[PDB]
Design a protein around this ligand. Structure first.
Ligand SMILES: Nc1ncnc2c1ncn2[C@@H]1O[C@H](COP(=O)(O)OP(=O)(O)O)[C@@H](O)[C@H]1O
Ligand SMILES: Nc1ncnc2c1ncn2[C@@H]1O[C@H](COP(=O)(O)OP(=O)(O)O)[C@@H](O)[C@H]1O
Lengths: 68, 138, 69, 237, 226, 400, 52, 247
């Protein structure tokens, strides 16, 4: 929201998936991810624009199912 | 651990043996390590006394509030004795923490009279430690 | 002669005041605690007169032993 | 120490041995996809065959535990075969002790209990193989379950295991979020396109082995080369 | 060695690590009301691929004994299976007492194979037990190493501290009717991150008539108007 | 760099009464008179100068040539005429001093003056007040005597004979041609040990004394633990032949551990070097190494052998008469009571050591000084027993 | 007490009436407290819009 | 230095057992005082969180037999199994001899099992010490204290809690044999419990006490309920007020 809705982001981008992580990703990385979600070979911020920076930085530490 | 610091401990022990036996100078130590068994060493320089610090009682804590709250301004009526007794055990440092917590709680309200409600909020500084999980295994 | 300015002698940053970079509530970290930090700002936010009378001894040094989080 | 060496609770309050076994499942270089449909449940996994001196007839990772339940194994092959043998023994023993056939959920529960016994104690070690088992169940439709080296038996509709399991699960989540039931053409095609998008090789109809259990036709059909080729032709049309 | 072990001078380090593990993240609140006991927990499945009617967090051990738990679910399955076997054995030995609440204390006591014979690695699950076949309800908690505590209202999740604080501030109280399940859901709401739904929240109730795991219909009905 | 210190103090410790009386007063008056007559004598002599001879031949020839500006630097090496001196900031000068050249007191590694400009050494700072690298001779020849201890007559005779084989009757085994530096291995209960020190002061009445207690399990790569003591014993030979009191390190630093290899390198280095120094065929000197311990069991077999380390001496617990004597010595300074309650405190006591005796005597005065202040407190008859219990003997759960 | 939905609504209403009376700094302070309280509820779709 | 349970020390001490017994002092507080025509136990209720219901009706005090009762002061996990084994031993003796088991024999059996636990095998010592009060035909009212070392002792006024030293000192100061009765024993127990518990005016909920009395040819082990306990507290408070004001 600082960069106003990620500079006019699309609806189908919600942070439900890339944040329920349990993979640290400190606020500095969060700000970097916000500023790196910027591949825009077109007009506006979209989903395909994201997926380059949205599939990049994938979340390694996992396996909470054994604990739950 | 027979390390460089241990050699320093040995030389410190060597020094205090000579100068204190060769004087208008005494040494007072401290041990918040619960027991002396974890640091039992040469008796001279410590065989003089082994005075221990009992944790303050409810009345002892009362007095520490009075010493710490004499400097401060507060409401006319306050049951300081019950305030200290509400704190389970603790120490004079916790009393200092409660007193400075009451001042900050009354600081946000900006009044000259620290109320009993703010003081009980200061008693909550004794909280946040508790036992966390109810282990209760004894 | 004596130089009045002291900050620029070895740089090491300068007066960052009078400039809104990140105001306050706009932080994303919400609180963590931020109540001891507001307790820390009580002395800058006047209240040193309220430090006396009320008899409190306000904190002087705040150490934050946290990662870049 | 030995917190990370034996099956003991870590000082931080975790269990690192099973956490390592779950990654052991990732070790081996294989992936599998399980998709439950409107009436059927299909599972497909790649058949990584290095050199043709091997017998592609028996290099499979999917098996028939009983007449109606079929599994697919992900991880080390020795532990996979051991768990398959244990599952077959459990199914037979259940059919002997109880007249009716063992429900797939109960079989998964028993296998997960065995795995939980393995992660318990310290003499033995957990088996580094994750098993996804499917089967038709009356009054329940198709059923798919996953038993892991820890002992947590769950999973439904669309579930995947292997190296690139996260991407497959994400794509299947997108597909299931798209609210449309899959018939016995769409379920197979969905699984095939999921595994193809995970590993883009266009999937020549020889490097995958799909198992299917429908409702009108029971039993774990290990579809032959002709069936997988026909499904691939229909999908790529 | 092969039992509950690793106890240094004045400590139970292995047990303490087990208690750190059971901190978990599933609140699983429990409230002992006048009419009965409510055990409500959170089923926050990862993504929508998983199912909610397949696996359950609340298990009826017997006719009117219900069970809810905490971290290390695979251990909880074995523990609840053992509890079912033990209750069944007690009912077979002492035939036909309809043993639930004269057994709830007993079954909690026989939760000594649960931890006092740890099995090299102690169990990493703390479980709440409810029973009401005595004219009065019962709520008990067994932890990875201790024994029965006979709670009236508690939580065993990631925010169990603030959950218990909410329970006491909201006055779990004694005159509360069977419909204290609203307060249990509210206590879960404090330790919940999302719009909780019928499948997201699983709750079982144990009144004098018996125990019953509430179906998603009633769970959604209660969640409505919250 | 250190040879001796000026011993012009300790003015006649033999104050016979040690208590306020007329005899002690007269002795103090004679002491104080003799101090003024000396201050008289030296002052009268220094100012009533024998003769006024110019500028004492000092300012006329040398003081001017020494100059006003000077800098201090160490002296490194000596050559026949010049001197090789390493001054400050790593400067080295090859210049012949000929003004205030006290060749005996210059020595290598000592601070000397430099007259600046044409840098020539013109003097030496003999004091230099900085030989502080390894200091163990600071407590040399302790003033404690035989009289400080009592009731240990058998051990005092044994240790004296072992240490008066040298000094006294050195020709005895010189003709026997052995010259044995055997030393003494001292046993004793852990309740004692500085008696192992107090019985050592009997020999410390002659020559100097060195102490190595606790040291370390010489983890140091150079080792040198027993080896710098060898250098210090060599320094002791340069001085009056001293003794090396290594109590509690002949047991720990020289431990009869069953382990052979991988044993902290002390067994490799310390035990071997101790035997090398304790063998008379390697190092000479009248140095006698007193090995005192409270654990006879941990005696290393090299240390066990009387062939190299002879004169084994056992320190037993004090007897009834010894307890009476030590209590008398410790309570003599304090004037316990006029009733002299002596035997009641020791008649039934057992396993009471010298350190305990000192502690209870000290605590008896402390308890009387607490609130029972009555000079010779009438309570001291039983308060001495009150603080002889004092608990604190041993405490460990119940187990019984 | 430890209610959360009511507190957010009360703080938001207090912020609204400060704005109606043009009490901007107290409205900002109340709004900041409204956010601090509103962090508890994860998906209050109506309430989150009201705060925004 | 500690290792597998069955070890010694270079000096020759069982430091694991000593550490466990010292840890028994940490946490829990029980005391037993023996008097004529009645012997009683006093227990300190550690956790008084308002969220409990107190339905077990006893936490520290355990009824182990018709003629005896115990009170543990160690970890509850071992305490439960030890109490079960003690009841089993007592009832086995009752079956074998058709007679209530003497208290000394029962305590010797329990301390034998604890000595076995600390003796052989790689098994932890039972980190729990418990008192016993009971009555028999031979010795009448008896009190025993057993530690995890397995070395029980026949006491008449003892405490096993955290401030056990302070409690036993208070007992020794204000203990009078022979003259002691059940009511005076109650008064002394409440007084010493008030001494060892820092908060004055102890509530009846934080203190659980049980008295064993000899009725007409029958042993009655009555745990004193809340009303009777607080009436004892009120009588003690009256005594304290009179004693303080009369100076
Ligand atoms: N609203 C926000 N909340 C939290 N962190 C933020 C916010 N905005 C920016 N940041 C990040 O906080 C970081 C501070 O980093 P840094 O000062 O290096 O950490 P540290 O102070 O621990 O050295 C910046 O890099 C920035 O990206
Ligand atoms: N028999 C004795 N007679 C006189 N003084 C003694 C006697 N024994 C010990 N002392 C003095 O008491 C002090 C402590 O003696 P010791 O028992 O050797 O110490 P530790 O027990 O600490 O090794 C010594 O400094 C010594 O001067």
């Amino acid at each position: 929201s600082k960069m106003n809705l990620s500079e006019e982001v699309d609806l189908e981008d919600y942070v439900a998936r890339p944040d329920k992580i349990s993979g640290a990703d400190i606020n500095s990385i969060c700000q970097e991810s916000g500023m790196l979600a910027v591949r825009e070979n077109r007009y506006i911020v979209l989903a395909k624009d994201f997926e380059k920076a949205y599939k990049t930085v994938i979340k390694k530490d996992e396996q909470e199912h054994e604990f739950y | 651990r027979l390390e460089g610091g241990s050699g320093g401990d040995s030389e410190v022990q060597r020094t205090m043996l000579e100068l204190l036996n060769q004087k208008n100078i005494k040494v007072i130590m401290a041990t918040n390590r619960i027991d002396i068994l974890d640091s039992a060493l040469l008796r001279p320089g410590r065989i003089d006394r082994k005075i221990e610090f009992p944790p303050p009682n409810e009345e002892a804590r009362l007095d520490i509030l009075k010493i710490h709250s004499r400097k401060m301004n507060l409401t006319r009526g306050i049951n300081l004795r019950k305030i200290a007794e509400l704190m389970p055990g603790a120490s004079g440092a916790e009393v200092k923490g409660v007193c400075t917590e009451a001042g900050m709680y009354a600081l946000r309200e900006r009044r000259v009279h620290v109320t009993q409600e703010d003081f009980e909020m200061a008693v909550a500084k004794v909280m946040q430690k508790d036992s966390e999980k109810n282990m209760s295994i004894k | 002669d004596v130089l009045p300015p002291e900050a620029d002698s070895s740089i090491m940053m300068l007066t960052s005041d009078q400039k809104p970079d990140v105001m306050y509530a706009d932080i994303g970290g919400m609180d963590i605690q931020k109540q001891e930090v507001r307790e820390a700002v009580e002395l800058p936010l006047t209240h040193f007169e309220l430090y006396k009378q009320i008899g409190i001894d306000p904190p002087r040094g705040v150490l934050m032993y946290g990662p870049p989080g | 120490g030995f917190d990370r060496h034996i099956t003991i609770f870590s000082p931080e309050g975790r269990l690192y041995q099973v956490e390592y076994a779950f990654k052991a499942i990732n070790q081996g270089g294989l992936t599998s996809v399980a998709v439950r449909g409107k009436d059927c449940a299909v599972i497909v996994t790649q058949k990584k065959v290095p050199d043709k001196l091997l017998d592609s007839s028996t290099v499979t990772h999917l098996f028939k535990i009983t007449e109606n339940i079929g599994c697919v194994m992900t991880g080390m092959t020795a532990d996979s075969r051991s768990q398959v043998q244990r599952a077959r023994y459990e199914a037979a023993n259940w059919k002997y002790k109880y007249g009716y056939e063992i429900p797939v959920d109960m079989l998964c529960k028993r296998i997960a209990d065995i795995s939980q016994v393995y992660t318990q104690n310290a003499e033995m070690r957990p088996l580094g193989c994750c098993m996804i088992l499917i089967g038709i169940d009356e009054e329940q439709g198709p059923q798919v379950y996953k038993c892991d080296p820890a002992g947590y038996y769950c999973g439904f509709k669309a579930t995947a295991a292997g190296v690139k399991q996260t991407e497959s699960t994400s794509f299947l989540e997108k597909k299931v979020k798209k609210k449309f039931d899959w018939t016995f053409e769409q379920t197979v095609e969905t699984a095939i396109t999921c595994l193809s998008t995970v590993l883009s090789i266009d999937f020549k109809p020889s490097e995958i082995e799909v198992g299917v259990v429908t409702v009108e036709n029971p039993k774990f059909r290990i579809l032959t080369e002709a069936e997988i080729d026909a499904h691939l032709v229909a999908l790529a049309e | 060695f092969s039992l509950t072990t690793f106890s240094p001078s004045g400590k139970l380090v292995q047990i303490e690590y087990a208690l750190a593990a059971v901190a978990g993240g599933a609140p699983s609140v429990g409230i002992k009301a006048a009419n009965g006991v409510v055990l409500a927990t959170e089923k926050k499945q990862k993504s929508i691929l998983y199912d909610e009617r397949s696996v359950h967090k609340v298990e009826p051990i017997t006719k009117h004994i219900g069970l809810v738990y905490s971290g290390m679910g695979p251990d909880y399955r074995v523990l609840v299976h053992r509890a079912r076997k033990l209750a069944q054995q007690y009912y077979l030995v002492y035939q036909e007492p309809i043993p639930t609440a004269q057994l709830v204390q007993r079954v909690a006591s026989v939760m000594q194979e649960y931890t006092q014979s740890g099995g090299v690695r102690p169990f990493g699950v703390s479980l709440l037990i409810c029973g009401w076949n005595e004219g009065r309800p019962y709520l008990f908690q067994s932890d990875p190493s201790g024994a029965y505590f006979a709670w009236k209202a508690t939580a065993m999740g990631k925010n169990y501290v603030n959950g218990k604080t909410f329970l006491e501030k909201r006055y779990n109280e004694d005159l509360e009717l069977e419909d204290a399940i609203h307060t249990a859901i509210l206590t879960l709401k404090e330790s919940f991150e999302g719009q909780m739904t019928e499948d997201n929240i699983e709750v079982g109730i144990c009144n004098e008539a018996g125990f019953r795991r509430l179906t998603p219909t009633e769970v959604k009905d209660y969640l409505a108007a919250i | 760099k250190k040879t001796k210190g000026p011993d012009a103090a300790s003015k006649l410790p033999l104050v016979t009464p040690h208590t306020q009386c007329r005899l002690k007063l007269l002795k103090l008056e004679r002491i104080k008179d003799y101090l003024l007559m000396e201050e008289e004598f030296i002052r009268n002599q220094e100012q009533m100068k024998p003769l006024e001879e110019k500028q004492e031949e000092e300012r006329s020839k040398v003081d001017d040539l020494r100059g006003t500006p000077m800098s201090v630097g160490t002296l490194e090496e000596i050559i026949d005429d010049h001197a090789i001196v390493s001054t400050s900031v790593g400067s080295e000068h090859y210049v012949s001093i000929l003004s205030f050249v006290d060749k005996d007191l210059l020595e290598p590694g000592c601070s000397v003056l430099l007259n600046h400009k044409v840098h020539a050494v013109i003097g030496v700072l003999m004091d230099d007040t900085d030989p502080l690298v390894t200091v163990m001779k600071v407590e040399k020849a302790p003033q404690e005597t035989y009289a400080d201890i009592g009731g240990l007559d058998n051990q005092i005779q044994e240790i004296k004979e072992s240490v008066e084989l040298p000094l006294t009757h050195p020709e005895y085994y010189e003709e026997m041609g052995i010259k044995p530096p055997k030393g003494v291995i001292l046993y004793g209960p852990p309740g004692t040990g500085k008696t192992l020190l107090a019985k050592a002061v009997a020999n410390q009445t002659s020559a100097t004394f060195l102490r190595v207690v606790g040291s370390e399990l010489i983890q140091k790569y150079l080792g040198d633990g027993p080896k710098l003591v060898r250098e210090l014993f060599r320094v002791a030979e340069e001085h009056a032949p001293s003794i090396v009191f290594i109590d509690e390190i002949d047991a720990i630093g020289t431990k009869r551990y069953d382990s052979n290899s991988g044993g902290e390198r002390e067994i490799q280095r310390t035990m071997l070097e101790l035997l090398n120094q304790l063998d008379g065929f390697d190092s000479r000197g009248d140095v006698k190494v007193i090995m005192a311990t409270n654990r006879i069991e941990t005696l290393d077999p090299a240390l066990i052998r009387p062939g190299r380390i002879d004169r084994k001496i056992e320190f037993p617990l004090p007897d009834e008469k010894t307890k009476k004597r030590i209590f008398q010595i410790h309570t003599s300074r304090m004037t316990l009571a006029d009733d002299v309650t002596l035997d009641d405190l020791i008649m039934a006591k057992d396993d009471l050591s010298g350190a305990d005796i000192k502690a209870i005597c000290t605590e008896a005065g402390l308890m009387a000084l607490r609130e029972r202040r009555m000079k010779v407190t009438n309570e001291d008859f039983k308060k001495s027993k009150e603080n002889v219990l004092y608990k604190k003997q041993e405490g460990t759960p119940e187990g019984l | 007490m430890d209610d959360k939905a009511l507190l957010v609504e009360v703080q938001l209403l207090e912020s609204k009436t400060y704005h109606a009376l043009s009490n901007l700094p107290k409205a900002r302070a109340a709004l900041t407290s409204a956010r601090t309280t509103a962090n508890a509820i994860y998906c209050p779709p109506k309430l989150q819009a009201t705060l925004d | 230095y500690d290792s597998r349970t069955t070890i010694f020390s270079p000096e020759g001490r069982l430091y694991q057992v000593e550490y466990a017994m010292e840890a028994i002092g940490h946490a829990g507080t029980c005391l037993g005082i023996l008097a004529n025509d009645g012997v009683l136990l006093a227990a300190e209720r550690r956790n008084i969180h308002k969220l409990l219901d107190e339905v077990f009706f006893s936490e520290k005090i355990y009824k182990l037999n018709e003629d005896m009762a115990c009170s543990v002061a160690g970890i509850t996990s071992d305490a439960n199994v030890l109490t079960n084994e003690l009841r089993l031993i007592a009832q086995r003796y009752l079956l074998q001899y058709q007679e209530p088991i003497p208290c000394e024999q029962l305590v010797t059996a329990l301390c034998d099992i604890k000595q076995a636990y600390t003796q052989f095998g790689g098994k932890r010592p039972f980190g729990v010490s418990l008192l016993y009060i009971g009555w028999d035909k031979h010795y009448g009212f008896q009190l025993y204290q057993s530690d995890p070392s397995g070395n029980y002792g026949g006491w008449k006024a003892t405490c096993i809690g955290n401030n056990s030293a302070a409690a036993v000192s208070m007992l020794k100061q204000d203990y009078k044999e022979g003259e002691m009765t059940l009511k005076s024993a109650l008064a002394l127990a409440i007084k010493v419990l008030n001494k060892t518990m820092d908060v004055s005016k102890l509530s009846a909920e934080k203190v659980e006490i049980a008295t064993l009395t000899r009725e007409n040819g029958k042993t009655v082990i009555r745990v004193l309920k809340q009303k009777e306990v607080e009436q004892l507290i009120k009588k003690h408070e009256e005594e304290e007020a009179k004693a303080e004001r009369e100076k």
